Ligand binder design. Sequence first.
Ligand SMILES: Nc1ncnc2c1ncn2[C@@H]1O[C@H](COP(=O)(O)OP(=O)(O)O)[C@@H](O)[C@H]1O
Ligand SMILES: Nc1nc2c(ncn2[C@@H]2O[C@H](COP(=O)(O)O)[C@@H](O)[C@H]2O)c(=O)[nH]1
Length: 191
Amino acid sequence: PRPVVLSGPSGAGKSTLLKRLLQEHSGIFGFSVSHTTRNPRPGEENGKDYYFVTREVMQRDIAAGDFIEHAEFSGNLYGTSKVAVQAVQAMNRICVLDVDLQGVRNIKATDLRPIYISVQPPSLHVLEQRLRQRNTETEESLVKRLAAAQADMESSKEPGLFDVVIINDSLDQAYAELKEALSEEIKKAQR
Ligand SMILES: Nc1ncnc2c1ncn2[C@@H]1O[C@H](COP(=O)(O)OP(=O)(O)O)[C@@H](O)[C@H]1O
Ligand SMILES: Nc1nc2c(ncn2[C@@H]2O[C@H](COP(=O)(O)O)[C@@H](O)[C@H]2O)c(=O)[nH]1
């Protein structure tokens, strides 16, 4: 069962869409718990949304070869450990990845063989509106996520990087498209 890489610009709505997928289809989808050095937001939980560690612990894991991939985004480090992917594969479920555009390029070089799905905002205007709506970032880190949005939206339209592109306008509309886009993986996971 091919893993699923969900990417796109920060604030498009991919975490929101993914939580709706993991809640409805918990028996077939498993979430890859990434490591991150950023502070946890209210509502997040260590070992579930992220492995929240300090930069020192993060760098030590890198020196120990713990990560399939890692990258820096808006002044913080993020990584997909080998453990995160094997933990889902040891549950016989579809490993779903939430990574940035640099994470897509890293995973592209691996043997994971995933299906790559871009989640796009309806426009750059709605993207900025969603980045500020979440309200979980300081003003300097908010602008840094805005700076990377343009190049992330462009690359989100390239077929060399993605197999599916979904416009997250309405949540109900985007969610049905994602499920339909994952029909072949849901089929393989259930058989
Ligand atoms: N289809 C949508 N319509 C309106 N708001 C949305 C939609 N999808 C997500 N949002 C809002 O955008 C904000 C950021 O979404 P999030 O899932 O964190 O995006 P990402 O995971 O891509 O960074 C959240 O507050 C969420 O409520
Ligand atoms: N390369 C990479 N990016 C990640 C990983 N985990 C989260 N990200 C990305 O880092 C950015 C920051 O997300 P947030 O800080 O809102 O959780 C998002 O683009 C998210 O997809 C990861 O393990 N690897």
